[PDB]
Design a binder for this molecule. Structure first.
Ligand SMILES: [Ca+2]
Ligand SMILES: [Ca+2]
Ligand SMILES: [Ca+2]
Ligand SMILES: [Ca+2]
Lengths: 326, 338, 328, 327
C-alpha cells in the first residue's frame, strides 16, 4: 500500500495526475501540497477544492510557497489550460478551501513524515508536479525525516522536472518546473540520504508517452460524471493545441505507483544549472561519467533519468480514471 | 523604548563582543540567539554561545540553525583569525547550558518569537544578523508576513553585518565573507516585501572606518605599564574573558583592530551612531565567477529609473558610524554591573 | 559544382580522416588548411598536417592560427585519445613542408582567400571548421563582409563540427569539446549577419549516430597494404588500444555533410546559440526547438542554424571506402 | 622624451577634449587615431574625428574599427549626453578628410604602427584607449608580441579610461560604460602577458574626483578663438542636460599617459573584469588584500595600476593649454 504526498501547482495535467493516484488500487493520497507555478497558490487551492468536490474526498490540502526559493520568478504563466489553469469551466466553488489548516505546505510535509510509520505493508512516496519550492524548503528545515520515504527498492521521491535532451519548453534549455525554481532543484538533487535515487520524469519522456486526441475523444465518451469533468478541464487546452496530447504530471504519477511502467532509464549524476544566461534551469546529466570520474569531482549516482515509459500502461491507467467506482 | 533583539550569529570573536554590547546596554534585552554556520561550525558555535552566557549567568535561549548555505556547498573557507574554535582556543570551561536548549531549528524559532511578539509604542523587536543569512532567509520563505512585526515606521526591524559599499571584498575580490557565504540568502533578505523600514546594511568598509586601536584595547582589558612591562593588573571577569577571546587574533594581526559585528549591534540599538548613509536599491550577485556574493548598489538611480526596472529603495547603506559612540559602548561592556 | 574548401582544424586523428575525405572526392579541392589549438597545440598541429600532406605529396598551403581561445585561458583539457601528439605517436617522418609555409596568421589567410575568391554557382567556396572556432571568429571580427562570398543561396558556406543536439556533453556535462574550447568564438559564428545559408551544425550526437564499426575499420585497413591504409592503421593505433563495437569519427562526418549535402537525411532549422556564462553549462549548445516566427521576432532571434540530426551512414562508409581506393 | 601616441576612441565630447590635450602638449605627437563603437557608431565617429582634425588642419591618419563588441550584441545603450551625434549636434562643416582615409581595419593599423615603431631612449610609444577595448583586444589576439614595443620599463605602454575603483557603475550598478561595453575585450587587455609596465587604469571615480567647474568652463571658452568656439559648440548639449562640476574622463586618461607626475596616488595589484554576472557583467574586480604568496597560489600577479588620485591643478592647466595653443 502506497501513501502519497502530492505537491502540485494545480493545472490541468496536475488534475489528471491526482485523479490517476486516487483511482488506483493500493494507493492513498494522504495530503496535497500547493505550490506556485502555472497558477497562483490561491487559484491552486480553488482548483484542488473543485477536484476533491468531484470525489467527495476529505484529503487535506495546504498553501505553500507563492514564489521561488530565491528571487522573483523568471518564468511566465503558460495559460494553455485557460486563465485559471483549470479550463475556465464554471465549476462550482468549493467549500473545502476555508476548512483547510493554515500550516504552510513545507511544515505539513514535515508533519506527515514525522507521523509516518514505514513497514513492508505501507510505503510513503512524494510525487512533485510543479516547481520544487515546498520540497526544498522542507528539506533544508529537517533533512533527516526524508529518509522515511521509499524503500531500498521503491523510490521515495518522483518529480516531474527537467529534460533529458535539453529540449527546453520554458527557455531554450530548461523545462518549466525546473526553470521556475532551479535553486530548489539543486537542493532536491544534492540531498544526502534518499533511500533511492530521485526519479526524474522529464519533458521528453512524457512527450514520448502522450495520448492521442482520438483516444481522448473515447476517454470523454464523445457521459458519466468523471468524463464530464475531464472534458470541461481540457476544453481550453483542446481549442489552443488541437495529433497528440502530452500529459506530463500523469506520467510522473504513473512512474511512482507502477514502477514496471519504466521501460528504460539511466542512473547517473544529475544537477540543475543556476548561473547561465540561456541555460538557467537546465538539467545537466553526467552521460559519460565513470565511478572513477565521479569520485574525483565529488559526484555520485543521485538520479534515475527516465527515458522510456510504457505507453500502453499509461493509457490503461487513464482509462481506469473514467471507469472508477469508489 | 525597550528593544527586544533576536541575534543571529556564527559565534566568532567579534560576534561575542557584539552580543556583549547588546547585553550591557540599557533598555535592550536579547531574547534569543540563533546560531548559523560561517566562521565556525554550528556545533562549535553552540559551545561558544554557551561559554559566553555562562560568563553572564544569562538564561537567554539559543538555537541550532543551518549547517550550510541555503543552496549548495559553501564556497567560502573558515578564516581562523580568532583561532581553531573561532573563540580564542582559550580553555574556557565547557557550558552545561548547551544540552538544556530546545531542539527547534533556529528558523522555526525566529517564527515562534515573531508569532508571540507583542509590539507597542513601548516595545520594539529587532533582528540583528551577524553571519551568513541562511536562517533568516529560511524563516522568511516559510512565513514572510510575520516579519512585519519587526521595527517601527522609524526604527529598523533588521540590521545586518553584510556586504561592501565599495566592493573591497575580504572573501573574494568583490564580496564580503557573510555575503559570499550565502548570496542566495542575501537576495531573499533584500528582495523581501513588507519590511517596515529598509534593511540597514552594516558593510565591511564602514566597520573598517570605525575600529578600535590596539592602544584602546590594551586599556579595555586593564593592561598597564608602566609598570613594567605590559601586564593585566586587576581584571574583572569581562576583561579577562575579552583578553582570552582575542588572544589568537591579537597574535595573528597585531595599529587598528576591526570589530564588524559590534558595529552592527551599535547601529541597531543606537541609531544616532549613524553619521552618514545612503538609501537606495541594493542586491547581491548570484551568478558571477569573480563577483558571486558582491553587493550591487544603485548609486545614481532616480525614482524614475528604479520604477522602470522594478527597483525601489530597499536598503540603507551605512557609510559612517560615530567612532566615539562605538568606543564608549565597548567601554560600557567592561564596566557592566548586572 | 566544383567545391573549393578552406579546412580549419586542430589536427587530430579524425581531422586527418576528414581531410583525406575532402582530398579524395571528385569535384572537391582543398585550397588551404588553417590550424587552430584544441586537441594538440598549434606547433604540433602544423607537424601533423605536414605529415599528412607528405603522404599525398600535395602542395596545399597551411597556416598557423590561434594558440588559445578568443578570450581567456583554455577551460578544456587535451583529450589524448589519439596519443600524445594526437596523431598516433606513430613515428611518421617529420615533414619538410612546415618551414616552407607562409608566416601569415590563419585568420588573415581566411580573409585573403575570401578576398581573392570569384564565387559563382559553378565554383563554390566552403569553410569547414573541425576545431575550436577561434580563427574563424577572429577573421569574422576583422572583415565580416567577405564571408558572404562563401556558399550559394542553396549550398552552405560554413559547416562546423561543433556542439550537441541533446546536450550529451563530452567535455563537461552539457558541452561538446570544440564548443567548450571556445564558446565566445561560437557566438561570433552563429550571431554573424550575412551568411548566404544558415550555419550547418554537425553536432556530437549526429556523429555518434553515424560511426564506423571496428569490423568495417579492419576491412578499411585490410585485415599486403597500400600507403593510405598503412597510414590510417598507424594514425588510429592509440585510439584503437584505448577504446576498442563502434568508432566515432566526428570531423569526417562534417566534411561529408559539406561536400555531399544529400547525406543529410534529417535536420532542423531554427535559432541556435552558445552559452557563455553558466557554471556547468559554459559551451552548451542552446537550440530553439519550439521557437515560432512570432516568438523569435520578439526575442531578436532568427533561423540562423541548421541542426543536423541524421546523416546517411551508408554514404559515409562509402566515402571512407573511397579514401583507401584513391588513385591520384 | 618624445611621445608617440595611438589613440583608440569612440569619438564623444570628452574624447575630443582628450585628443585636443594630446595635440597641444609639447613632446607629444598623435600618430594615429583608431575609431571604435561606443557612445556613437563608427561611421559617426569617423565624421567626428574628421571635424576635429579640420579644426587643427592635422594630417593625422584615422581608421575604422569594430562596430560592436568582441563577442555578441552590445549590452549597453548610447548615452546621448553630448547630443545625437555625440559631438554637440553643432552643425560643424562635414570633413573631406574621412573619404581620404585608408580602408585598413583599426586593429590591423595598431599592428602596422607597432611593426614600424622604432623604440629608443629618445622616442617612447603609448596606446591610450578612450572607449570599449574591442580594437585593442582584437589586435592583441592577432599578434601579441608586438605590444612589447609600447612603453619603457618606467613609462606605461597602455593607459585606458575604463572600469571603477569602487564599483560605482554608471552603466549598470557595478560597471563603468567602456568596461560594460566590452567585458571580454577588458579581460584580453588585462590578462595579456608581456606589457613592459602594468596597464594604468584610469577609472570612473578618479575622473569624478578631478573634474572641471562650470565656472572654470565659462572662463575656458572665454565667456573668443577658434579653439574656444569649437569647445563651446561641442559641449552645448551636455551643458543643457547636466548644468557644479563637469567630469571629463577621457581627458584625465590622456593626462595620466603624458604627464605621469599627475598621478598623486595609485595602487598596483591584480585586476580583471567580470564576464559572467547578471548584475555585475563588466564590473572591475580588484584584489585589494592580495599578497605575493596569495597571488602566486591563484595564478595572479600585479598586472594593473589602479589610479586613485590625479592632480586637479595639473589637469586644469592642461585644459587651459588647449585654448592658448599656437601651432
Ligand atoms: Ca504541474
Ligand atoms: Ca559574525
Ligand atoms: Ca578536430
Ligand atoms: Ca570615450
Amino acid at each position: 500500500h502506497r501513501k502519497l504526498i502530492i505537491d502540485t501547482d494545480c493545472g490541468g495535467d496536475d488534475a489528471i495526475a491526482i485523479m490517476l493516484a486516487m483511482t488506483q488500487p493500493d494507493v492513498e493520497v494522504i495530503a496535497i501540497t500547493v505550490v506556485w507555478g502555472n497558477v497562483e497558490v490561491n487559484q491552486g487551492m480553488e482548483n484542488i477544492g473543485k477536484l476533491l468536490d468531484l470525489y467527495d474526498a476529505d484529503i487535506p490540502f495546504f498553501r505553500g510557497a507563492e514564489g521561488p526559493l530565491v528571487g522573483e520568478r523568471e518564468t511566465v504563466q503558460w495559460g494553455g489550460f485557460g486563465s485559471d489553469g483549470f479550463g475556465d469551466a464554471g465549476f462550482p466553488p468549493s467549500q473545502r478551501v476555508a476548512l483547510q489548516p493554515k500550516r504552510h505546505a513545507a511544515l505539513e510535509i514535515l508533519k506527515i513524515l514525522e507521523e509516518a510509520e514505514p513497514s513492508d505493508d505501507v510505503v510513503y512516496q512524494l510525487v512533485a508536479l510543479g516547481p520544487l519550492t515546498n520540497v526544498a524548503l522542507a528539506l533544508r528545515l529537517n533533512p533527516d525525516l526524508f529518509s522515511k520515504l521509499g524503500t531500498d527498492t521503491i523510490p521515495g521521491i518522483v518529480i516531474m522536472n527537467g529534460t533529458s535532451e535539453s529540449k527546453g519548453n520554458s527557455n531554450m534549455a530548461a523545462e518549466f518546473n525546473s526553470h521556475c525554481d532551479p535553486e530548489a532543484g539543486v537542493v532536491v538533487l544534492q540531498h544526502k540520504g534518499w533511500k533511492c535515487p530521485v526519479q526524474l520524469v522529464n519533458w521528453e519522456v512524457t512527450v514520448n508517452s502522450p495520448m492521442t486526441w482520438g483516444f481522448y475523444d473515447k476517454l470523454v465518451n464523445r457521459q458519466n460524471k468523471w468524463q464530464e469533468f475531464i472534458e470541461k478541464l481540457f476544453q481550453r487546452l483542446e481549442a489552443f493545441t488541437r495529433v497528440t496530447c502530452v500529459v506530463p504530471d500523469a506520467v510522473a504519477v504513473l512512474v511512482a505507483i507502477r514502477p514496471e511502467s519504466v521501460l528504460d532509464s539511466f542512473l547517473t549524476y544529475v544537477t540543475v544549472e543556476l548561473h547561465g544566461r540561456e541555460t538557467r534551469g537546465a538539467t545537466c546529466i553526467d552521460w559519460y561519467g565513470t565511478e572513477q570520474s565521479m569520485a574525483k569531482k565529488g559526484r555520485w549516482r543521485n538520479c534515475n533519468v527516465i527515458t522510456k515509459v510504457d505507453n500502453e500502461m499509461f493509457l490503461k491507467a487513464l482509462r481506469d480514471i473514467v471507469e472508477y467506482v469508489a
